[PDB]
Each structure stands twice: as C-alpha cells, then as structure tokens.
A paper describes a structure:
The [name] complex (SEAC) is a growth regulator that acts as a GTPase-activating protein (GAP) towards Gtr1, a Rag GTPase that relays nutrient status to the Target of Rapamycin Complex 1 (TORC1) in yeast. Here, we solve the cryo-EM structure of the native eight-subunit SEAC. The SEAC has a modular structure in which a COPII-like cage corresponding to SEACAT binds two flexible wings, which correspond to SEACIT. The wings are tethered to the core via Sea3, which forms part of both modules.
After extensive sample and data collection optimization, a cryogenic electron microscopy (cryo-EM) reconstruction of the SEAC at an average resolution of 3.0 Å was attained. The structure is composed of a dimeric central core that serves as a symmetrical binding platform for two identical flexible wings. The SEAC forms a hollow, C2-symmetric cage-like structure with dimensions of approximately 251 Å × 302 Å × 240 Å, containing 22 protein chains with a mass of approximately 2 MDa. There are two copies of each subunit, except for Sea4 and Seh1, which are present in four and six copies, respectively. The central core contains Seh1, Sec13, Sea2, Sea4 and Sea3Cter, whereas the wings comprise Sea3Nter, Sea1, Npr2 and Npr3. A flexible linker (Sea3 connector) that tethers the wings to the core but is not visible in the density connects the Sea3SIP and Sea3SAP. Sea2–Seh1 and Sea3–Sec13 dimers each interact with one copy of Sea4–Seh1 via heterodimerization of their zinc-containing RING domains, explaining why Sea4 is present in a 2:1 ratio compared to Sea2 and Sea3. The Sea4–Seh1 cage is stabilized by interactions between Sea2 and Sea3, which pack their α-solenoid domains against each other and link non-interacting Sea4–Seh1 copies (I–III and II–IV). The Npr3C-lobe makes the only visible interaction between the wing and the core by inserting a negatively charged loop into a positively charged pocket in the Sea4 β-propeller.
Numbering used by the authors:
A (entry chain F): 1 to 249, 287 to 348
B (entry chain A): 128 to 158, 161 to 182, 211 to 290, 298 to 322, 337 to 399, 433 to 556, 654 to 679, 694 to 712, ...
C (entry chain C): 994 to 1061, 1073 to 1077
D (entry chain B): 937 to 972, 988 to 1038
Amino acid sequence: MQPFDSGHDDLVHDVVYDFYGRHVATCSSDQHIKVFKLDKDTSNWELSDSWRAHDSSIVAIDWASPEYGRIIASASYDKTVKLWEEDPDQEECSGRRWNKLCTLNDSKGSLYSVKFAPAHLGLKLACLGNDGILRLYDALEPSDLRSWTLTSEMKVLSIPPANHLQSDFCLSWCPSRFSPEKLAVSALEQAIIYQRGKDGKLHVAAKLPGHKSLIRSISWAPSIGRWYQLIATGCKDGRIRIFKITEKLELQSNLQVELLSEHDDHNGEVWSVSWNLTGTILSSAGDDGKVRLWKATYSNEFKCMSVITAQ
Amino acid sequence: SSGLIYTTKVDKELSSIDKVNDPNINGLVCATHLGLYKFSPSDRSIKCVHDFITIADVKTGFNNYKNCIAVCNNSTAISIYDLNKSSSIDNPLITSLCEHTRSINSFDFNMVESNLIISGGQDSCVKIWDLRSRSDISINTASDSIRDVKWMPGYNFASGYKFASIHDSGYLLKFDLRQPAQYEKKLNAHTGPGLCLNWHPNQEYIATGGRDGKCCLWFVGFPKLTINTGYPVTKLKFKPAYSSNIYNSLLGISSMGDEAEVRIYSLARKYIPKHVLLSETPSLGLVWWDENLIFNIDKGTRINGWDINKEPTVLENLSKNTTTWRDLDGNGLLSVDQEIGSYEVAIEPPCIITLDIPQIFNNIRLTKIAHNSPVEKFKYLARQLKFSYIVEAELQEKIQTLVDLISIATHNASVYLSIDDLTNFKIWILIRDSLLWDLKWMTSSIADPPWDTKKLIKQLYNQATETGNVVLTVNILFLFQTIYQITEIDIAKDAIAHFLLLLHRYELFGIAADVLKYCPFEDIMGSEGDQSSIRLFCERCGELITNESSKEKLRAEAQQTGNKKIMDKFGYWYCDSCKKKNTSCVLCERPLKKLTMVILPCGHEGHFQCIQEWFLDENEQECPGGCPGVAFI
Amino acid sequence: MPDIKVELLHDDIIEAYEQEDLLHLEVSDIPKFQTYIYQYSKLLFRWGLPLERVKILKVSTDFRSSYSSPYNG
Amino acid sequence: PRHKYCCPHCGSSFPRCAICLMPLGTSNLPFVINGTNRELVSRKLKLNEWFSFCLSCNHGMHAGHAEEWFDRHNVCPTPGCTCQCNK
Ligand SMILES: [Zn+2]
Ligand SMILES: [Zn+2]
Ligand SMILES: [Zn+2]
Ligand SMILES: [Zn+2]
Ligand SMILES: [Zn+2]
Ligand SMILES: [Zn+2]
Ligand SMILES: [Zn+2]
C-alpha cells in the first residue's frame, strides 16, 4: 500500500474501515464524506464516491455490519445523525451513489460520537453529544432501514455542560459476543462502562479513574481468549491509559478496574487510540504528526514499539 | 465561557438590540422596551438600566445625530426618540415619519451624513427622509418586498452615499443617493427570499443570506465565498476593523428558531467557525460594541456579552489525527497527514497514510542486520491445520479420544514443521507428549506438577493469548476445552466467535465453514438454528413442501434395515400432498435432485452446467423457459 | 505523497538477533543454584565420581562469572 | 427489486448463505466470489453470487461459494447436516 491524497478541502476528522478492509470512509469538516475502494490491480486507492452529507463539520463516522448492507452513519455539528445506504446502480464519483436513509435530529446539542453496536445485538446505534445524554437507536425490524426508534436515553452527566465549546465525547462498544452488553462513555473527564441488566435498561458498571483532562478517544479491545479486557483512552493532557477490565459472573457481572499502564510519551495532545484485532498492539496518534504503536512486554506493562513520522 | 463578561436578566420580552455609537459612555439600546442598558467593567454587570418608556430592528444614529434611536411600534411609521429628552417634564417624542402603506421591515441611520436615514418594507418603495425638517426621495423597487436595507459604512480608521437592498425575489439591488430610481448594480443573490444584507467595513463587499442557507459574498466595487450553513440565516453583523484582505473578515452568522446560536465565522476558513458562543436559550440579535466585545439578546431575555480575544478557538478543539487497524500484523494502518492552518491568510489536501507495517518492518530489520507475508501464513495455518476432533465404555472412549488427539497434535506439529516455524512445533510437541502421558496413566489405571496435562496446556494457552497467537489458542480451545476446562465457556465461545469474524474479514469463507461445521459449541454464530433453510411451497397445489410422510416412511424402512442409503431418497423436489413427481431443469428438462441454480426474477431451477452454459457459453440474457424480462449474466 | 519516517524502538527480532544465548537467565529465575549445585557436588564426591562435581561446579562458577583460594599460591 | 430481493409482506431478507452468512438474493456483495475474454470472466464473477440450493437438504449457498466448497469437500457446510450435495 501507499499513501494517497484525498480531495478534501479541510481537515479530515474521523476515518473508519469497513468490515473487510477494502473500503475507507473519510469524513471531514468541509461537509463531505469520501468513500474509497482498494483496487486489486496496481494496489492503490481510487475514489468511489464523494458527496455532501451535513451542513457543518462531520466529527464521527462508522460502518454497519456487512450482513445489514453498506450503511455508514455520520454525526456532525448540525445536531443530526444521517445514515447512508450505497446504491451500486449509480456510477462512481457521481455524488448520487449513497442515498440518505434517516436523520435522527433529536439531540439539542451537537453530536460528537456515533458508534454501531456489535452485529449480534441487531442493527443498534449509539449517539453522544453536547446535550449530555446517551441515545440508543435500534431497528427492531431490520427489514426496513428507515425505521429507527430511540430505545435508551441515559443521562451520563449529573449536569449538562455550561461550556459547550470546550467538550469532547467518545463511545466504544464491547465486541464480546457472549459477555453482557457493555458500552463505554467518555463524557468530559470521566469514563463509565454501561451494562444491560435484567431490567433492559443501562446501568453504571465501573468507572475508569484518573483522566485529568478531556477524553479525545476511547477504544475497547477485542480479547480473543484472554481472561481480561483492555480499554485504551487518549486524553487532551497527552496520556495514554490502558485499563485492565476483569469480569466475573441488576447487573449479571461485577467489574473491577485496574490501571495497567500509563504513557505520556506524546509530548502534546493525543487525538486517537485504536486497538488491532488481537487486542495486543495499540495505535496512538497525536497533534505532532506522530503515530506510536504500543505492545505489551513480558510483564503487564505496555511499551512503545515504533514511532511513525510524516515528514 | 472564558470570554463571557456581562450577563443579566430581563423580566419582559425583547425584540432587538443596538449599540449606542459613543466612545464616552458604555450603554446599549435594547428593543415596547427602550432601555439605556449600561455595562461597567468594574462589576461586569449591566445593572445600570435607564427605563426610558414586531418585524423590526432598533438602530441608533451616527455622527452629529449621536443621540437618536428609531423603533417601530404600530408597523406603519418610524418613531424617533432622544436619550437626552428622557425627563418627566420633557416630551419623550420626536416627530415621527409615516408614509409606508404596509409593514416596515428595516431602517438604518447613515454613518457619513447624519441628517439622512433609509428604510423599507412590504410597500415596495425605498424612501429617503431628512431629520432637520413625507419623504424627500422615493425609489420604486418594481414590486419587490424589501426585507433589509443597509447604508454603506463610513467607519473612520487610520463613502456613505450608496446603499443596497435585499428582496423576497432574491435580488440584490445596489443604489445611489445621487442616482434615484436607477439601481447602480443588480445581482441575483439567492433562490427564494433573501433575508440578510450587510456591507464589509473597509472594502466594497456585500455578504447576504436567505432561505437557501448559503451566505454568499458579493463584490460591488458567481459569488466570492459561499458558506453552506444549511439553515435559514436571519442576521449578519461584521466586526468593526480594518480588513486589508477580504478573507480576514470576522462575520457573525445567526439564525432564528429553536436552534439559534452566535456563530462568528472568519472568511479565511469558511468551513469551520471561530466562535460558537451559545446561550441557554435561542438568541435573536447580536451587535458589535467594538473590535472585541459582542453582545446578544435571547428568548430567555438575558443580555449576555462575550470577549472574542479571550475565547477558545473551535479549530483547536477539533480532532486532528486518527488511526485504525485492518488485520493482525498491520498490513493496513492509517493516519491523516493534515496541517492546521490559521484564520488569517487555504489548506493543502490532507494525505491519508496507508502503511504496510510488516513490509516496512522487514525492510528495516534486514537493513539493520546486514551491518514473510504473515497474512498468507495465517491463510496457510487456517487451511492446513486440524481444528476439529472429528463404565468401561467411558474409559474406552476417553482412550480413543486421547489417541486421535495425539494424532491431531502430530499432524499439527508436522504442518508447522513444513513451513519451518519451530516456536509452535515445540508447543505442539509439548502438547502431544502431555497427551501421551495422560494416555499412559489412563492405560496404567500441595500443588500439581508443571508437566501435568491440564496445567501445561493452560499455561501454553496463556502464553499464546498473551503473545498474540490467535491460531494456536483457538486450536487449543477446540481440541482441549471439554476434557480440560481451560477457561469459562463464555471466554472460549467469544474467542471462537472472534476467530470466525477474523476469518470472515479476509476472503476465507470456506475455512470458516470448515471451522463452524465441527465446532463443539453449538451457538457460536447465530441463535436461530437453521438460518440457511429454504422451505418451499408447491408450484402445483400451493401447500408447503415439508414431506413428513416420506421422511417417516424412509426412517421406518431404514430402522427395519441396516443401511443409511434409504434415507437419501428423501428430498424436497417432490410433493406428498399432490403427488408431484420431480422438478425439471429449465434447459434440459431432466430430473433435478441434489443441486440447483435459481433464476431470481422468474423462479426457475437448473443445474450448474446448464445455467452456466446458457449464460456464459451461449452468451444469452433471458431465462431458458421464456420470461418477459432480462435475467442477465 | 509525503515522506514517512519509521523508527523501530526495542524490536524483538533485532534483540533476538543480538543474543548469542538460548536463554536470558537471571539470578531471579534461579535463586538457589549455588547451594543446590554445591550440595550435590558434595554428594557426588561422597560417591566415586570426583569429575562430575568438578563439571557441575565449573558450570555454576561459569554462570556466576557470567552475571558478575584452594588452587592458588 | 432488480438488485435486492426481500419478502413483500414484511421486508425481511432471504435465508443466509451457508458459507459466508450473507443474505441471499442480493447482488453487488462487498467481496468478490472468485469461485471454482474479460467479458466472460466478469459474467462468471457476477454469476457466482446467485441463489443456489440443494433439493434434498434445503440449504442455500452462493453459486461460487458452492462451487468452491464442493471442490474440496463432499458434505453440506451447515453444521448437523449429512447430505452429499455434489453427487
Ligand atoms: Zn404439491
Ligand atoms: Zn439441466
Ligand atoms: Zn424464467
Ligand atoms: Zn416475510
Ligand atoms: Zn455466500
Ligand atoms: Zn444440508
Ligand atoms: Zn443437500
């Protein structure tokens, strides 16, 4: 693979893979979404569609599960979440390929994070924004993609933020198919894990400590066979925090949180963290143009493996 | 916020706000309230209120008429007021002006000639009055509904004889004081009604806005800049400054409705705002006191004030870089190589950095030691490994299970030794010898020793799941979970599900089918059971093809006999209710029993060879049976 | 396209290439090698095997010199 | 419904494929079914994603997925089914 130059007229905010790794959707602040495809010939990225989605900066994007179709969901500063289903009959690079499904204009504040649930929960979607409440949108009938019902409205804050311009929200789902449903909320300076009990409603399970500044990213780790789970949080202060979550079977399981590691190696501000599919290597991108990869050592302590510079 | 300075509350409703153009005093006029709202920096309060006694906006006079305030009350006339004539004895009324036959939408005092005022509205006539003296000069606008008319600003820094008009017809009409009844410059501003009109403080640039939600910049000395706000914009107020370049202009975009906020856009970055100053209630009007302070009113009747020199920037808070992973090794790892610009003179197109981490790392390693392709390795180990296993009777079954598990371990060790990775050949040799130890103690029949079978297999599992060897831990979870309880059933099933999702992420679906077919856990992917079952209704009688009588008869015959080949006569190609014999191919008209190929729009069966020949070798596009349509390819 | 600079920090492959030993043992791994080897050397000298105790003490002394006078004068 | 087939009464999709667990009756899948003169190759590739099923065990597959599965195996890919759909 080689780096490719986008057609974006401003900063690219959130970039999210599809399931198969053959498509890249880049949302940017220029009110545009550009979905790319990986051609088998010549091994270079070619643009597939590029259309205007919102009336402001799109700050989050996420692909749906491949069994439900080619669905992306975009959250922006227009207090809306708009879904897009790909129509393959239209020509590429035309602007009419991706058709809007539904607009979930229910947040009084600008929405910061959108995340799809794991595929074994059904087509379930999450929203977090400036209003300070977590919204869950389910398609109870996945037959029609235009029928979204708000199924959970949980207040993640004691009070809404007065300083609306200085805030940042993030969400991360738990991909464990047979553990109970867990959701991570990083509202302003906390981090709360939410579980679904027998009541069918979200409850506070555990709180990740520390986090002296705003949380710019959160990422649950896919634990393939491990007896513990990992949560990676990037902060405005610049500290990577990896939390070792242990689960033992009203909630059906109690969670204990142990701060496994803390890393302030980004001399500045960390904007994104993301595990790989093993839950072993963790990426971390800062505002200095540097990307660091973290792998756990022989002890229970992560160390930096490489630094990627974009000179 | 940080830049918030002044706030208060008002017990009654408000409509508009304007600034007293006076460098000595620090008051404001809020619009039937007309209060000289004075703020003081000592206490940061606007508690100094002088209670001096609709689709309109209040405006204050300029130059020699430094104390005149105009407001509309009866929607038919302009009422002028004086702040000095506010005593009880003094009459608080100035001679009103009334010629509009319809509602008045806008008026504005002039900044160069204090004795001249402008207005407009639904009467389709722009009129000019005189304050030292019915209007003097009247200009017809050809049946265009005036919404806003603003003078050309003087703004004496280190002229005023022209004005423009916005209209419901979407036309911007530049005029002249010395040229009545003849517009100087005519421009088509917006589709639909235009609701905004203002001039740039220094250069002759006009920025408008309407129901289209596109704040378009026009040169009056297809637009210059276009800001697709999307919402119907209602108010624009440029900051008071000397902008030598037109792109360094701070512009206040605001709307009216349930979602109203003070948005201060710099023209250098038309996609990101600079200040998203927000109040607890939707706002109505915003004015600029000076180069720094900007106030507003709201539906909650709070006179809030902000300082733009002490406010966080929206660009700094936005996300700057992102990372995602594609697979285990890191064949696809992304970033964005974007630079942050400024709000003064736009951005080079950002480069998404897709990196082949294993290839780069192998290059750096071979460079460092001079003084492959682990995705293909994952495919090879997913394909060529043996994941699947398939009172004296229990002992014999356990012995046979140990024996063919030893055989599976030997095969896995051999296929690791085929590709020459000794680090897992050693693991499977250890597992094979532990199973042989368990077999010899079953045949022969404080803490456990480290060479105990369960403890050693669990420790190799833990080392595999700490290192990151997905294939080896998943193989151990299939082969040695029921007999040796390694972890909980939830963790094992989650690992198998994640391995199958990982196999689905690559184009390895037959391997995932092999893995799921002989999985000891029956509820790994899906809980509906038979999700690939296709029940059919009969083409002749319409009842469902379940064929329970035939299955019962064949089960009875296979129970009375000793062969399982009688049960191979069961099928869904025949109906028991209507005695349909067989299903015929659409091309060769032969019986069809074991594999078909359904044509979708018409519902016809067919062999692989027949359908493939008809649609590739003969290059045909219709159904062989003949259908009103094209079942192409 | 820009120029990407990659800096490996503490790569395991390079460190394995920079190691001539099969294992990187430490005193924390084997805390009591000296006493056990010395006592078994005494037991070997009580038997008719006087060379095996010298072999085992040479191994122990080689490891002791690796991580860090009756035959002098 | 020239590119996606669903039930007219409720809208639910077709039964899933036994190999890739994608709903059947839908064209333009995210992947390429390269199952077991560029026009004939493209026709074969777009022919591989069709609706194929056995009339003895009633288990559905894509045409390319069934061709690639039965080039190495001889049993139905669904767990719990013993039906030699090849011959
Ligand atoms: Zn019938
Ligand atoms: Zn045939
Ligand atoms: Zn037909
Ligand atoms: Zn149905
Ligand atoms: Zn399939
Ligand atoms: Zn079957
Ligand atoms: Zn079959």
